[PDB]
Design a binder for this molecule. Structure first.
Ligand SMILES: COc1ccc([C@@]23Oc4cc(OC)cc(OC)c4[C@@]24NC(C)=N[C@@]4(O)[C@H](C(=O)N(C)OC)[C@H]3c2ccccc2)cc1
Ligand SMILES: Nc1ncnc2c1ncn2[C@@H]1O[C@H](COP(=O)(O)OP(=O)(O)NP(=O)(O)O)[C@@H](O)[C@H]1O
Ligand SMILES: [Mg+2]
Length: 378
RNA sequence: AGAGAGAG
């Protein structure tokens, strides 16, 4: 039930070569618990702290199950955003590099004719996608579910939310009745867990109490801003005060991302911005330029709150507080990846500091006032 | 009715 070495998981030699080439050495806590029941075919609900390696948990399990000589799609992974799907596809391709497993991204904002021409010719072993384009390709029969034996929902509690649950159900109805289902997330509320009883067969539950989700390496602070009209000057002050690797600044609406980005540019501050109403060509460039370090400060919506992994991010600023409790955990988790040291700063008006106290109580955490004029907080 | 989530 606990297997502390990749060497003891009965993985193929090519899969192990790919794991070690990517730079892993020992499995994370969640990997030691969840890879083997997934390989064995059990329905699994896998929860673990942000940044602990849930991607490779399902990636390694899918790869080990692939029948390489079967030229058909055998596994389908869904993610809530295009950026997250693209990121998962790269991890899966890297881990399976020595196996020649094929992994295809089925995501919106890409040219449909080009995808259709690829899928008319080849049946990728592994599909990583977003729900809209996946449902589209299933309806037009360019993706076949005939041999899909593994269905993975990353960020599963978001995928089973009001906005996505019906999309996931529509896709699920296309799949064979015997398909294995694997769910992963940092957050798994009891109401989402009840929805899983409707479609998962007596799953293995690896769950983490909410009071244990917060990372020790992510120091959480708040700043009394009192008035919303004062947030902009506070941000500008934090730009000049704080030591700057890379930072993500979260905003609750696309409209306000656009507003804030213009305000910062007018004041000669260098920032980039991304949200879901931008052309996908622009999203791809912005994401690429943040990954490379060309841009160090990104203003974004919850488009980038879940799953995105930029190791150099050490600072998250909640310029708007998240209304949703679960979202708070995902946001601050963009800093402090795989045990790195991070800071999260919450900007709080009078009306916000209630919402803040409820977050503190729910997660049994403590959020401290940010020191004055301290450049290096943690 | 936030954020995302095919297409045109
Ligand atoms: C027939 O093939 C499809 C494929 C995809 C889609 C959809 O994919 C979307 C993705 C989007 O990304 C920006 C936007 C978007 O609409 C503005 C849609 C949808 N297009 C339309 C017209 N309606 C949608 O909103 C669908 C939806 O959720 N509802 C409640 O309407 C049924 C949605 C969907 C349904 C099942 C499974 C996955 C996704 C509908 C029908
Ligand atoms: N065994 C491992 N050894 C070293 N690094 C690892 C290992 N497993 C995963 N990582 C790295 O850990 C980082 C976070 O992995 P990722 O899979 O994005 O985390 P996660 O659990 O899905 N986080 P989140 O989606 O926000 O809940 C990545 O940079 C991985 O490459
Ligand atoms: Mg993840």
């Amino acid at each position: 039930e606990i297997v502390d070495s990749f060497d003891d998981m009965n993985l193929s030699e090519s899969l192990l070569r790919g794991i070690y080439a990517y730079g892993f050495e020992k499995p994370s806590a969640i990997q030691q618990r969840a890879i083997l029941p997934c390989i064995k075919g059990y329905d699994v609900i896998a929860q673990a702290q942000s940044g602990t390696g849930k991607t490779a948990t399902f990636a390694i399990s899918i790869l080990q199950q692939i029948e390489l000589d079967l030229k058909a799609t055998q596994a389908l992974v869904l993610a809530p955003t295009r950026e997250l799907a693209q990121q998962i596809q790269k991890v899966v391709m890297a881990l399976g590099d020595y196996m020649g497993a094929s992994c295809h991204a089925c995501i919106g904002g890409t040219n449909v004719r080009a995808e259709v021409q690829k899928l008319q010719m080849e049946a990728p072993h592994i599909i990583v996608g977003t729900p809209g384009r996946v449902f589209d390709m299933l309806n037009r029969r360019y993706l076949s579910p005939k041999y899909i034996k593994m269905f993975v929902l990353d960020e599963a509690d978001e995928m089973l939310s009001r906005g996505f649950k019906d999309q996931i159900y529509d896709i699920f109805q296309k799949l064979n009745s015997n398909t294995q289902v694997v769910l992963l997330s940092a957050t798994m509320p009891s109401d989402v867990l009840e929805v899983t009883k409707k479609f998962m067969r007596d799953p293995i539950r690896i769950l983490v109490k909410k009071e244990e989700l917060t990372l020790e390496g992510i120091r959480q602070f708040y700043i009394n801003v009192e008035r919303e009209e004062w947030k902009l000057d506070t941000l500008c002050d934090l730009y000049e005060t704080l030591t700057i690797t890379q930072a993500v600044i979260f905003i609750n609406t696309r409209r306000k991302v656009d507003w804030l980005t213009e305000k910062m540019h007018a004041r000669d501050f260098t920032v980039s911005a991304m949200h879901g109403d931008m052309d996908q060509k622009e999203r791809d460039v912005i994401m690429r330029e943040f990954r490379s370090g060309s841009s160090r400060v990104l203003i974004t919506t919850d488009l980038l709150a879940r799953g995105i992994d930029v190791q150099q991010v050490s600072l998250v600023i909640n310029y708007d507080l998240p209304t949703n409790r679960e979202n708070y955990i995902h946001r601050i988790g963009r800093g402090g990846r795989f045990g790195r040291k991070g800071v999260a700063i919450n900007m709080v008006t009078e009306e916000d500091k209630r919402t803040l106290r409820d977050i503190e109580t729910f997660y049994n955490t403590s959020i401290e006032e940010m020191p004055l004029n301290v450049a290096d907080l943690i």
